[PDB]
Amino acid sequence: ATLCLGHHAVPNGTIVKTITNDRIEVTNATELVQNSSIGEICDIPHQILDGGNCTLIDALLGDPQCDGFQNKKWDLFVERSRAYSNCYPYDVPDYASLRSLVASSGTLEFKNESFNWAGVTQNGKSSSCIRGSSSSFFSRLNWLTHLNYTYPALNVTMPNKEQFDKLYIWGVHHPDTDKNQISLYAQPSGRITVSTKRSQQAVIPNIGSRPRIRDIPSRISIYWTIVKPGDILLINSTGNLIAPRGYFKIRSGKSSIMRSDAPIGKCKSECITPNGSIPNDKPFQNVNRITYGACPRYVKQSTLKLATGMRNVPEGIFGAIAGFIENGWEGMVDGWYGFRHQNSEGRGQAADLKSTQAAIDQINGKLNRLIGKTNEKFHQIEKEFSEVEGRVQDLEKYVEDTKIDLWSYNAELLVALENQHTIDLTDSEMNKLFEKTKKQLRENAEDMGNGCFKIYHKCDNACIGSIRNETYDHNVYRDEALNNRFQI
Amino acid sequence: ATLCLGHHAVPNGTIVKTITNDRIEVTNATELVQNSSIGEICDIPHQILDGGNCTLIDALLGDPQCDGFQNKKWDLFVERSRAYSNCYPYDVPDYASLRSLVASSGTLEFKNESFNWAGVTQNGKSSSCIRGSSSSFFSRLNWLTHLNYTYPALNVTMPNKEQFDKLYIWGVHHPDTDKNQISLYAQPSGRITVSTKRSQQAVIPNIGSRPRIRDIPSRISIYWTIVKPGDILLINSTGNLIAPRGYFKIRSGKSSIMRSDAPIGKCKSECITPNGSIPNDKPFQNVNRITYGACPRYVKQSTLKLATGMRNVPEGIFGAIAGFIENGWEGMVDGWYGFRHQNSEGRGQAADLKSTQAAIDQINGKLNRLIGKTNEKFHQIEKEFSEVEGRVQDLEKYVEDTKIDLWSYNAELLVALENQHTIDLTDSEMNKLFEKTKKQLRENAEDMGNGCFKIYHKCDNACIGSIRNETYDHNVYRDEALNNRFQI
Amino acid sequence: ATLCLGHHAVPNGTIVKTITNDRIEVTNATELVQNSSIGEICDIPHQILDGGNCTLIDALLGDPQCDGFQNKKWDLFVERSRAYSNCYPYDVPDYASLRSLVASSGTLEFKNESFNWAGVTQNGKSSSCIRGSSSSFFSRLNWLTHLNYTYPALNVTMPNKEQFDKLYIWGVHHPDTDKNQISLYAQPSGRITVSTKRSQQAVIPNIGSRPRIRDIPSRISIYWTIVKPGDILLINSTGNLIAPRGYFKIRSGKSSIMRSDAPIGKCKSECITPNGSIPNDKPFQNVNRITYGACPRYVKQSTLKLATGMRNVPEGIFGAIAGFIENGWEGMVDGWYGFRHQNSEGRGQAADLKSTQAAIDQINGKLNRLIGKTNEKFHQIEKEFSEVEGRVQDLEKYVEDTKIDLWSYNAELLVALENQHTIDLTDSEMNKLFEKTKKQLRENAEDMGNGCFKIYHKCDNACIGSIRNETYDHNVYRDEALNNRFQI
């Protein structure tokens, strides 16, 4: 009889990378880089708020377009690129910081407070800000002006008797002219001091024409202040104050904001990107560096294939597969390793289950460490910028670029080591089954060197089966075998 | 005779992770993550300065509570969370930067300088700042006011004739009212310009009530300026100047500051955390991301076990351990690998020293690369924040979170590769001792397949010993062995 | 006959590090850390602009020294440490940001625009700024002052009808005295508002003596503003305006700036450092963390040797090299593995080509992954600082230090894993050639255990050659061999 040890092969293998080889074919691999989105943001499990035409900041101030956003909450606020401001023209010094802190607070919940604006007109309006047919203003702000050509210095307080922090949004009006300055606040100067036991902010208006927006050459600047529990807001002004009508709760949670034009859909997905949700089964993704939720890590590579089978040899350090075994057996489809024999009763093929299962368990082990293991991230840094800003933006970008190169490196190295190891462990399993069989045969057979043993005795099907199920008793055939082997 | 090769096992193994296995038992492991502190800051080798009730900044300005800190130096300044300000109410725009640069300078050494404050009253005092029973002020600052209802414009210089940089601390007073403005500085305006050949800073006071602190509704703002050698300080003011009384040396060294409530103790420890000192023998730690000194790197994992022994098989790619050798020998306690025999004189067990020492040396090699190898870090970035700040704080936190995920990744991968390698190299040593023995026996013995040889000749204790010490001469027994082996 | 399998050795090996060994000798290694520069900046392929005596900013404003830089472009602008300002004394709030954004724009291209400066004197001059024998000014700036003791409020526009962004550089003059204030701008106040539909910047001068520079106690502050296509610049001022004479194009490309005192040379090199160009064949470098172009990654290690040959054993997990083969063959110089024999015709040595080529191909595979693979980087963050700045600088440095430790870690681990693997794969190749030969010999030879076979039949040179070329037919000699082997 002849008993040959072998392993399977497939007609259609896959190319992977190892430590030593850019391009080597295995029987099977799996992709570790997610490269597509379904192109929609799934609305489960994260609570999504579609900004539509409104920026977060405009929803905050109460631009008329944004009245539907009053007191809303979100896990992720989605800002659309078509969003536009449609109220009094304003800027926010350190706009990105205000956006950021509201985003991660995750709420626009507002509470009215009663201020003693003694001696001034309230509820200033503008046709740059139309609410319902008429001149209006930011819903959360209170434009104060002269009453009877008098603007009597303001000096109001508001203790924080609450358990939580209050966020106050206020402003300063910059009139285009000294004339408008006078006719608005009956006063040439105009000064604002807003303070607490912990902080002070002081602002003087800057008079001058700015280019007209909805016919307004004047401008408002927006500021904010956080009042801790037991502290006190004190607003001391003699003109130009755009006053708050109350406070926002400021919370600390996992909320964020993302710029995206992707539609919201009724589906479930843990990981969100501007492009849409992406599955998070893979450890890496190449869809977008901007992400929210439990997401694969962003890498530069568009693909990284993890070998999930042995080297494919159609028809490693252990020397068996692609070694002393000339090639794989495509006809073996019920196992990874097995036996072909020829004896007096014919020629046959049988899978070896234990060795097949050993290789598969090791590979499944690798997969369990790498698949469905992603990390959860929420409010991050900004990663795209529409305007040159210099030093801080240079650092923001450098930090992300650094991080991405390091992860891309981790990904490349991980797959190469794992693949080299997969090829070696599968080669080893082959070598181990061969060795175990050789030992079973003792003096009754000889290694032909091509993975085949010549067995020097009659070995019928039951005899072959006794080898494969490891009950073969070499003593039974020894006399016969030694006589055939050692003749002249 | 029968000669069996084997390896040890222990009743109580340890679970470790490898590339292929989340949970596999070895004979021994070591922990690579430091997870506890002694709960005290050891006062050797770093020179520790306990801030007690004083912030660094208050020690800098000379709050009365902090007189004991005059001219002190430190490697690490420890700020306590109970610290509180107890002098005139002040703020420092960019407070964190001033704190940071004094911290890393490591000295409060001060040098008096004589300024020509011609025509003003000096040494302004407040009951918000009590020194010894009476109204006082920041020791390092000089509150100037009117003399005889005159405040004559100040214009003073101070060349830096020194070899080193000078740090000047100064301020501007913000009176609550135009009345107090007048009664203090006999002047409505008030302006400050402090300049050098290299820089200029200009400040106007902002009049208005802030909430009262120790009954003061006024406030001081603190500023600083660094004067290079050969440069000149020029202070040009017509009111509101809180003047310097001299300069601080500004040094560049390894000094830092840390917020901690841990007590200082008389002991020695290279690595300090807010929780207390931690040993630095391990390469990683999970105690605190804030550290000072030669410290293990912070990771998320609470434990990472490095295998320091073979797979434990009570009673790998090489197929010997947990392979053709059915199990380990718990009765073998003087070696890792060895021999059990049965011959005419009895049954015995002996360790093999060379193979045991080969496995141990390799493992010790790994340990020497990983143990006691920690990296020294001093003044870092801040890693905890008591207040929402936006953009820069978002970047500070993102940088640390990024770094920590990358190191945690490094740690996880390192231990898995090392453990897989440890299991393989110990399996290999087993396989190598088996092969070497088989070769010694030549034609005189046969491999039974379970790590045991059947020796076909009388092999007494000396004979067994000749095998183990590698002096066995197969020629001596060949005739006898061939006759027993190849009979019918 | 005797047939011995062996491998080469060299008299002069190299020490490398592995996972288990700090110091182990191989036949050959290669250096992975570039540690030297040619000490010159090569002027191909990057377009280099030598700043000589001029900072970028001075070339931007048009300091007289810098007239040769008008409208120049660059890939890399090189600033020399001897550079000095020689015009009116000025500062730029956020200087580093302006430098940065011009650097990466890569152009000083300027376009004259005609402003309507109605009612003022133009072309203000100073002896602090000498052009051609006479008092001059920044070429790109326009110092406006009173005309006939009148300074009539300015209010000019300039639409951006272009397709691209415009960068405007402007300033505010700070006179030393209220007197000079009057005599310059016929006005006590002085205010500047520069605005667009997107932004507003407002500046008031700060009067006061600063220390004299080229006899000027006054100072200019420089500001900038970017005007998007379809937007409008509006400059509204009543004094102190240092006006623009036009705009710079602001581009987005790969341009940067570097501080260096290295001379420019006529040579070609992809990677530039302040020290000079460095070859980029190696994956790592220790020359400078500041780099431009396709550059090896900066690491702390001064050397990292990658094994490119087997363990050197003069005269691993597979047990062959430095194992059952007592030592290497220094006399074998045409191959890595081979055969020595003694037969009736003499004693000889022959290389085995297939096994030699297998080891070499694997090693070349590793090298191809690591050599000539460097990554291209352009404008980065700053990495050296001449002045204490606090929080942002602390983050800039912390980010770079973090990155460098992570890459140094990657480098150390990479070389140790690769070297351990190289030693194992070369040991394996040895073991594989031995096994294949043993199998060829079948029952005709015995393993002596030291890598040598005793062949039990007459085996002349052709016979030896049949073994080495794998045509040996064991059946031919079997009878003879069995008779010699199994005699009494």
Ligand SMILES: CC(=O)N[C@H]1[C@H](O[C@H]2[C@@H](O)[C@@H](CO)O[C@@H](O[C@H]3[C@H](O)[C@@H](O)[C@H](O)O[C@@H]3CO)[C@@H]2O)O[C@H](CO)[C@@H](O[C@@H]2O[C@H](CO[C@]3(C(=O)O)C[C@H](O)[C@@H](NC(C)=O)[C@H]([C@H](O)[C@H](O)CO)O3)[C@H](O)[C@H](O)[C@H]2O)[C@@H]1O
């Ligand atoms: C406060 C104000 O309304 N300013 C007006 C301005 O008003 C002048 C005009 O009424 C004349 C004739 O009566 O009188 C001047 O004042 C005299 C006053 O009668 C007298 O009592 C005093 O003693 O002496 C002075 C002499 O100076 C007034 O200065 O007139 C111009 C031209 O009509 C207005 O500009 C136009 O504004 C348009 C936008 O209008 C609003 C808006 O935003 O919708 C109307 C808003 O109700 C008003 N909101 C508030 C709270 O006031 C705002 C607000 O003033 C601005 O937005 C701030 O910039 O303006 C549009 O811009 C058009 O292009 C302008 O020509 C100016 O608003």
Ligand SMILES: CC(=O)N[C@H]1[C@H](O[C@H]2[C@@H](O)[C@@H](CO)O[C@@H](O[C@H]3[C@H](O)[C@@H](O)[C@H](O)O[C@@H]3CO)[C@@H]2O)O[C@H](CO)[C@@H](O[C@@H]2O[C@H](CO[C@]3(C(=O)O)C[C@H](O)[C@@H](NC(C)=O)[C@H]([C@H](O)[C@H](O)CO)O3)[C@H](O)[C@H](O)[C@H]2O)[C@@H]1O
């Ligand atoms: C500079 C000053 O002392 N301001 C006082 C203020 O003084 C007024 C009062 O003396 C009246 C009666 O004489 O006269 C006013 O001035 C007139 C002046 O006599 C006359 O010559 C001139 O021609 O015309 C004016 C008319 O206006 C003075 O304005 O009085 C109030 C009420 O007493 C004081 O407020 C109280 O201050 C308390 C804190 O006191 C200190 C402190 O900090 O401890 C005392 C310090 O010595 C003083 N330090 C210095 C260098 O001045 C400081 C300092 O002024 C403030 O800290 C700055 O804010 O105040 C406490 O706050 C209490 O709640 C207040 O009612 C005010 O200090």
Ligand SMILES: CC(=O)N[C@H]1[C@H](O[C@H]2[C@@H](O)[C@@H](CO)O[C@@H](O[C@H]3[C@H](O)[C@@H](O)[C@H](O)O[C@@H]3CO)[C@@H]2O)O[C@H](CO)[C@@H](O[C@@H]2O[C@H](CO[C@]3(C(=O)O)C[C@H](O)[C@@H](NC(C)=O)[C@H]([C@H](O)[C@H](O)CO)O3)[C@H](O)[C@H](O)[C@H]2O)[C@@H]1O
């Ligand atoms: C604008 C100016 O030139 N300021 C001069 C200043 O001029 C005074 C002087 O002319 C006297 C005598 O005629 O008159 C004063 O004005 C009177 C005026 O005649 C009258 O019509 C009005 O009604 O009443 C006033 C009464 O005050 C003038 O104030 O004189 C001083 C001393 O000479 C000058 O300081 C010296 O400047 C030197 C540097 O000179 C330049 C320069 O930078 O090179 C000359 C430049 O041409 C000038 N550039 C422009 C656009 O003006 C600049 C510029 O003023 C400064 O740089 C801004 O600081 O100065 C040098 O610094 C020397 O150390 C000074 O003593 C002052 O420049």
Ligand SMILES: *[C@@H]1O[C@H](CO)[C@@H](O[C@@H]2O[C@H](CO)[C@@H](O)[C@H](O)[C@H]2NC(C)=O)[C@H](O)[C@H]1NC(C)=O
């Ligand atoms: C400063 O100049 C601008 C013109 O460049 C003035 O604003 C323009 O005024 C006209 C009619 O009054 C408007 O129809 C334009 O829309 C305005 N232009 C822009 C783009 O804002 C401005 O009024 C001038 N300043 C003063 C106070 O005289």
Ligand SMILES: *[C@@H]1O[C@H](CO)[C@@H](O[C@@H]2O[C@H](CO)[C@@H](O)[C@H](O)[C@H]2NC(C)=O)[C@H](O)[C@H]1NC(C)=O
């Ligand atoms: C802060 O508020 C108080 C008003 O309560 C201001 O002081 C008053 O201002 C009025 C009108 O300008 C003066 O005529 C009074 O003499 C002041 N009253 C008192 C009690 O002093 C003060 O101007 C405000 N300050 C700011 C920053 O606007």
Ligand SMILES: *[C@@H]1O[C@H](CO)[C@@H](O[C@@H]2O[C@H](CO)[C@@H](O)[C@H](O)[C@H]2NC(C)=O)[C@H](O)[C@H]1NC(C)=O
């Ligand atoms: C502005 O308002 C506050 C009151 O809200 C004034 O400060 C208070 O004054 C009383 C008595 O004068 C003190 O006992 C309180 O401690 C003060 N309150 C706080 C929390 O600061 C302030 O004086 C007013 N401003 C002016 C100048 O009129």
Ligand SMILES: *[C@@H]1O[C@H](CO)[C@@H](O[C@@H]2O[C@H](CO)[C@@H](O)[C@H](O)[C@H]2NC(C)=O)[C@H](O)[C@H]1NC(C)=O
């Ligand atoms: C800087 O210092 C000088 C004083 O040495 C100031 O100029 C003087 O100010 C006085 C009093 O206000 C005037 O009456 C004199 O005419 C000025 N003397 C000279 C020599 O010019 C100047 O005001 C100070 N500037 C600042 C920023 O406070």
Ligand SMILES: *[C@@H]1O[C@H](CO)[C@@H](O[C@@H]2O[C@H](CO)[C@@H](O)[C@H](O)[C@H]2NC(C)=O)[C@H](O)[C@H]1NC(C)=O
């Ligand atoms: C404020 O003081 C400085 C002197 O410390 C004055 O500037 C000096 O003036 C002399 C002669 O006028 C010059 O030769 C020096 O070079 C100046 N010193 C420096 C270092 O700037 C300044 O003029 C004074 N201010 C005023 C307006 O009186």
Ligand SMILES: *[C@@H]1O[C@H](CO)[C@@H](O[C@@H]2O[C@H](CO)[C@@H](O)[C@H](O)[C@H]2NC(C)=O)[C@H](O)[C@H]1NC(C)=O
């Ligand atoms: C912006 O420009 C306009 C000038 O076009 C300024 O307003 C004029 O200023 C003059 C001179 O000071 C006044 O006498 C006129 O009454 C104003 N003209 C108009 C049409 O209002 C305004 O001062 C400038 N503002 C700034 C910021 O300098």
Ligand SMILES: *[C@@H]1O[C@H](CO)[C@@H](O)[C@H](O)[C@H]1NC(C)=O
């Ligand atoms: C996703 O969005 C980014 C940003 O626009 C884009 O560059 C990327 O190609 C998109 N990718 C996919 C797979 O949709």
Ligand SMILES: *[C@@H]1O[C@H](CO)[C@@H](O)[C@H](O)[C@H]1NC(C)=O
């Ligand atoms: C958003 O604005 C556009 C154009 O101004 C308008 O046509 C559309 O109806 C608005 N959409 C929403 C979400 O109301």
Ligand SMILES: *[C@@H]1O[C@H](CO)[C@@H](O)[C@H](O)[C@H]1NC(C)=O
């Ligand atoms: C150390 O301090 C940090 C910060 O408070 C805390 O979260 C951590 O659990 C503490 N750990 C130990 C081991 O003392």
Ligand SMILES: *[C@@H]1O[C@H](CO)[C@@H](O)[C@H](O)[C@H]1NC(C)=O
């Ligand atoms: C710190 O302040 C507390 C409470 O104000 C006081 O009881 C204690 O004595 C002070 N401790 C020191 C270190 O002086």
Ligand SMILES: *[C@@H]1O[C@H](CO)[C@@H](O)[C@H](O)[C@H]1NC(C)=O
């Ligand atoms: C290169 O420049 C840096 C910065 O001065 C210096 O520290 C380094 O040693 C220099 N190295 C070489 C190899 O020229």
Ligand SMILES: *[C@@H]1O[C@H](CO)[C@@H](O)[C@H](O)[C@H]1NC(C)=O
């Ligand atoms: C640069 O300035 C120095 C010293 O001021 C001068 O000698 C030299 O000629 C200048 N060099 C150039 C590049 O013009």
